Chain length 311, copies 5
């Protein structure tokens, strides 16, 4: 079967729509999400026109093999979508209404700069390649673009699902390609990060600072080194959940900065001990008293500077 | 093949039933479960009616290709169910009795608030889309809804498998959809959490409190910081098994609260030492004696408050 | 094709056999194992009978599509078995000899109570559903039930592969079902658990008890808390390899009991220190001397009690 | 299509060959490897014979459906091989030359006794089942057995790929089976184990022995217990990479033996302290001086004994 | 269908091109990457030639079954590529222009020597096997070799995608094979390794060196042993992300070298203590003062030596 012939020199318009049924498995590391949706296609094929009196039916149902169907593909998928045709309906003028239900693993990059307070725009790019006989162009039928109310993405808030109505038409290997951009806007549910990572990490840091109210070097060494180890554990935990980014993330910056605080606390604890042994505890006392104020103040100001730079 | 024609303007009733054979792989993180069941479908097709006297046979068996079969789909599945038709039987009045055996990975959200003392209602939504010639409506045939006695879900108690008999009929892309809700009620087997997480976690906490019967700062620092590290290990273990929720879970609340107890024990241990060095051990002794009662009492009361808020 | 017609009102006997070729991937957590075997089926179809003199041939070979083959399914599989027909041979009396080679992921529960000294009975349930024309019943041909000598299940000793010759005939959705139970008896190779978990766990426990030959509280605290942490690591390791059971396992019981020993050693270490500070080292010395005998004796007796209850 | 008929009572010889293209994913735990290779089959079918003069062609090309092809299977595969026929060529005498390219996950057991200085013989068993009309026997065409030069198995040195030319002919379910053994000999690249596990493990052990040059019990306890914990980490790491064996592995033996050294160092550290407190430091000094020589000497000799028993 | 017949004794040239659409999942451990691309094939088939005047059409479109298509395969793939034909266009001279969209998991070895500052050349080898009638040779059409601008490989910078225009023609099982090498040059994004592994590792090492400004053996032992344990954690982390190489990697060398520094710091800390106890603190003081300079100087020089040898 060949494509529909034109009335003039006009391209064939395939009206599209995606209606999300299921949204799942947003893998932060892989920068992928799985979708289960309806793909709706509509175009005119005057060769399929018919008389309702003669045929008996007001609308004819065809099997995909029986008629010409445009080869619509997803750009940013891992493998070809698993699709099952739901219906193909032809009206007397030859207007075809195609519907399939598909599932696909979409590959859409994520911006981790503001993690875990980041928002993303996930993309689903629809594409059609023009044939030699006719040029095929994609369109968005907004009445056929939407999402189910129950659509839930674990750890994410689904904001909107809209399509950029004007396709990106371009040449690829001496043939026209019509590409549509469906955008799923989401924002991360940061809640859990507060009791699971952020607050535990702050508590261990604050525990290290109790060494500023102790003259016991042996005890101080234990306090700062132990909490440092707990921080390393949280750092490894965070980096196992996130991909390796060529930029600094907000959590990354905070986690890294905290190492410097542990490093300087070790210096302070060492300096204080050196002085006590050198029979200069008056000088050591001045440093320890200053550290009690300096450490929380510098920590608070640095965090303000970071939150400012990132948000 | 086209759908059965109506006597009046009545919709076509497809009587349904799901009989669970196998229930497995309830992934808490993915909020998915795998099912292996029988799907039973039954509708009247007057075109398939026959006289038992003339034909000789009491029932006719057809192959799926030979007759019209409604396109029944599951809403909350990852991919289309893997199905194998078991039997298609037509009675003289044209009543078709379809049976298939399927397997599918169902995506049904879980409420982790009361974890590990939580119960869930897993859902399996059946759906049919109406055609242009006729409107299709789903029904529940309760004699064909059930589960095998051997049906076991590791770490879960299967309470009931029932269907909400009245379908949710609604319009989707200018066509009627008939959706049925099959509910599998389960309750978690909390037993293992007691010796594996809860009691180990309480033991390490109680070990930290022995610092209230010690004047040795160096030993105290070791007791409280080491047990804190063991608690961090249990916290990381628990959060690796559970998904990130936008709410607090019972275990989450307890685990988080315990951090505060470690933080205050570090303060007490620091205060006691500071006073001893300041030659005020009488004041330190009052605080340490109070802490011996205060810590277990506040721990017990806080836990009562939490259990109350959560149950 | 319809099933063979009966001579009287007798059911159709499908003689079965499973010959295991490959046994692999016994997942303790998933309670699943993968199998690769031969499935042999044999039944009489009088319609396929022939005279060896007239036809010339002693046996006729058919393609699965040409003749009626009973729809034999596995009950306890994740998905339908991947099968490939090897041969279909018809004898002059119409006796069909079917052979296929299949692979399937079998879901059979495990009893972890005696772990890692546990034995299991893995099941492979064969099933046939009766048709309206005839009732189908399964039988075991013991000459066609067996296993390859090379059949190895990593970390398990394959004891026997036998079938319960009398099928469990029952009604399911107003039709007769004939179910056969093939049992694969295995026993765990406990060897590795001794040098990898059991002995390391005992060594760390015995190291904690050296605190009974030390008056140094700071050193004692280090001994008991450090070894406790190593025990936690072994506990987490064991619980990551096993599923969550609503009962206590042997290893689980031992691991849990050892926590109590660590808890009481911390109490002893605390009591001894408190007394030394209170200028009562004579009383402390009595307790420490008693603990040296009490701890190993109570440990040995408790273990005897546990091994008794579990075996 | 039926198999070729015999001239006498001779069996049909199917000449085989496997040419490895790709070798990957040798899973030590699963005892599996993935292969991508050419399978070549050759047999005489007199029915396909032709005169090159009359026909004009020197060779005829057939599609698999057109002619009889022997059902060749792999014994030790998880699932049936994914195969794609490359060519089927018939010579005038009726000699068929079949070639397919396949990929399969082969299940071949590993001997971990000498790990990580072990060598393995991976097997690929080819098999053919005899039909009722004729008995089929396999043969090895050595000009069609080989491997690509680029064939690389990460962390392994591919030594040889050869076939045991004489098949193992035997009866299975009253039919002859012809089994061929293709052996892929490999040897592990032990290099990485030296800087990643072996040397780190020895360094931590040697650090524990510095306690023999210290009278500080508190410091000694820290040295021996901390290094013991690092050893536990390496033990867990090693056992996560290897399967549970019913025998001792070389690395397993060394790792286990080292626990005894830590246990005896704790005893020495305890004994030395007990004596110092008992005002017998002269006796303690003799034991500590002896331990300085005894520990490395016994460690060296024990290792010689182990290497001897294992190699 | 047979291949095109030659004009002389010339081989058939199949002009090829790969246009990368999607690049993902570069597994460092597996040494694999997944690709989604266009495969373009072009060859002359004189049998398909037509007159544009007589036929009316400028180009004829065929279905893959209708015409002869060369069996083009990928050498270094796990399984056969998942492919979907996009278009087949024949020009009047019989020039066929084939286009398919495929996805494949490519197995291409990586050189980890300079990790994480390494660059790789990923390969995609195209291959065609010659038939008996004609010899098939591959060519590169450079106008049909390229990549999408959006092509992103997480943690990698895509440098170039080019083809080695001259194929590697060779004999394999007495038939000519024409192999083309498509090279995708990439370079790792080392950024993240600096704050995640490199700097944390240096900080813990520098913390160990504060023991050179302490006379407290107990505190020193804690400093050096604790930081050593944190280093072990980073070593295990790094080796879990990388495959086992028969050579030293840059990171591997640095990580290993740092163990020696910890070992020598333990010796220094032990020597200093031994001397203090022997009433020789003057000699101990000389060693500790030297170590303060020696350790950073030897560390800096050793690192210069390593960076030199590796880059
Ligand atoms: C007054 C002392 C200040 C010390 C500042 C240390 C700066 C280190 C910069 C690292 C850059 C990367 C190498 C680790 C050395 C730790 C410092 C020891 C301090 C001893 C104090 C003695 C008091 C007289
Ligand atoms: C040390 C601890 C550092 C914690 C940083 C606070 C969070 C923050 O600063 O987060 C920033 C986010 C921003 O959300 P946004 O809508 O994307 O802002 C976009 C605003 N523009 C468009 C102007 C740039 O605010 C929150 O979610 C607030 C609630 C989180 C509080 C957590 C407290 C612990
Ligand atoms: C009487 C002293 C009370 C101390 C209470 C500390 C409140 C900390 C609030 C944290 C909120 C998040 C920053 C960590 C400082 C630790 C406190 C050190 C106490 C020293 C006691 C000295 C006795 C005279
Ligand atoms: C610190 C330690 C905290 C432990 C909390 C106790 C458990 C609890 O409070 O659990 C609560 C569950 C509730 O079960 P439910 O049927 O869902 O109650 C629903 C009741 N409504 C409908 C009225 C809200 O009770 C149990 O399972 C009791 C047995 C567990 C004991 C574990 C002891 C350790
Ligand atoms: C004679 C003292 C016996 C102590 C027994 C403690 C029983 C704890 C039961 C826990 C049940 C769950 C809460 C932790 C307190 C630790 C006990 C401190 C002992 C101090 C000894 C003082 C010596 C006079
Ligand atoms: C603390 C350490 C506790 C170790 C417990 C010993 C093992 C045990 O008691 O194991 C019990 C198993 C039982 O094997 P069974 O055949 O199933 O007994 C069934 C007997 N009935 C039918 C009478 C109930 O004996 C063994 O495998 C013995 C060898 C293991 C020795 C490990 C020593 C370390
Ligand atoms: C001279 C004392 C030798 C000690 C030998 C210990 C053998 C342990 C065998 C374990 C077998 C399983 C139970 C742990 C006890 C540790 C030993 C404490 C030694 C105290 C020394 C006192 C010096 C007079
Ligand atoms: C404590 C540390 C123990 C380290 C044991 C040394 C290795 C060993 O003994 O390894 C043994 C392997 C054997 O290789 P094979 O060819 O299989 O010997 C087969 C010989 N027969 C046939 C005679 C039995 O030798 C090597 O690979 C040597 C290089 C490794 C050196 C690692 C040093 C660290
Ligand atoms: C002057 C003493 C130098 C010590 C050098 C140690 C070399 C170790 C070589 C290991 C090779 C692998 C076995 C561990 C022993 C640690 C050394 C203890 C030093 C004690 C110093 C006493 C001062 C008189
Ligand atoms: C102890 C810490 C050791 C850190 C080693 C520094 C990195 C290095 O030396 O890295 C080397 C890479 C080389 O990149 P290249 O283009 O492949 O050089 C090829 C050059 N030839 C062709 C001459 C051989 O330089 C970088 O990426 C520089 C930036 C990284 C700085 C990280 C600082 C921390
Ligand atoms: Cl697609
Ligand atoms: Cl479905
Ligand atoms: Cl099955
Ligand atoms: Cl196979
Ligand atoms: Cl391929
Ligand atoms: Cl050659
Ligand atoms: Cl050739
Ligand atoms: Na079509
Ligand atoms: Na149908
Ligand atoms: Na059949
Ligand atoms: Na065939
Ligand atoms: Na073709
Ligand atoms: Na310590």
């Amino acid at each position: 079967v060949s494509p529909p012939p034109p009335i003039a020199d006009e391209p064939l318009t395939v009206n599209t729509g995606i209606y999300l049924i299921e949204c799942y498995s947003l893998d932060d590391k892989a920068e992928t999400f799985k979708v289960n949706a309806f793909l709706s296609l509509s175009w005119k094929d005057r060769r399929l026109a018919f008389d309702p009196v003669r045929s008996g039916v007001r609308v004819k149902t065809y099997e995909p093999e029986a008629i010409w169907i445009p080869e619509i593909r997803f750009v940013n998928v891992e493998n070809a979508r698993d699709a099952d045709v739901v219906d193909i309906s032809v009206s007397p003028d030859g207007t075809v209404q195609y519907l399939e239900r598909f599932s696909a693993r979409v590959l859409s990059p994520l911006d981790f700069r503001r993690f875990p307070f980041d928002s993303q725009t996930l993309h689903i790019y629809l594409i059609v390649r023009s044939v030699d006989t006719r040029n095929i162009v994609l369109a968005v039928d907004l009445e056929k673009v939407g999402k189910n109310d129950d659509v839930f993405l674990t750890g994410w808030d689904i904001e909107s699902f809209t399509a950029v109505v004007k396709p990106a038409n371009f040449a690829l290997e001496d043939r026209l390609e019509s590409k549509l951009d469906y955008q799923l806007r989401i924002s991360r549910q940061y809640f859990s990060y507060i009791p699971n990572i952020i607050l535990p990490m702050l508590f261990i840091l604050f525990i290290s600072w109790t060494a500023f109210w102790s003259t016991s070097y042996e005890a101080n060494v234990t306090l700062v080194v132990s909490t440092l180890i707990a921080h390393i554990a949280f750092n490894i935990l965070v980096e196992t959940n996130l991909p390796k980014t060529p930029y600094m993330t907000y959590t990354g910056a905070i986690i890294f900065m905290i190492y410097l605080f542990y490093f300087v606390a070790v210096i302070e604890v060492t300096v204080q001990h050196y002085l006590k042994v050198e029979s200069q505890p008056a000088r050591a006392a001045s440093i320890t008293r200053a550290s009690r104020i300096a450490f929380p103040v510098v920590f608070l100001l640095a965090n303000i500077i970071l939150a400012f730079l990132f948000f």
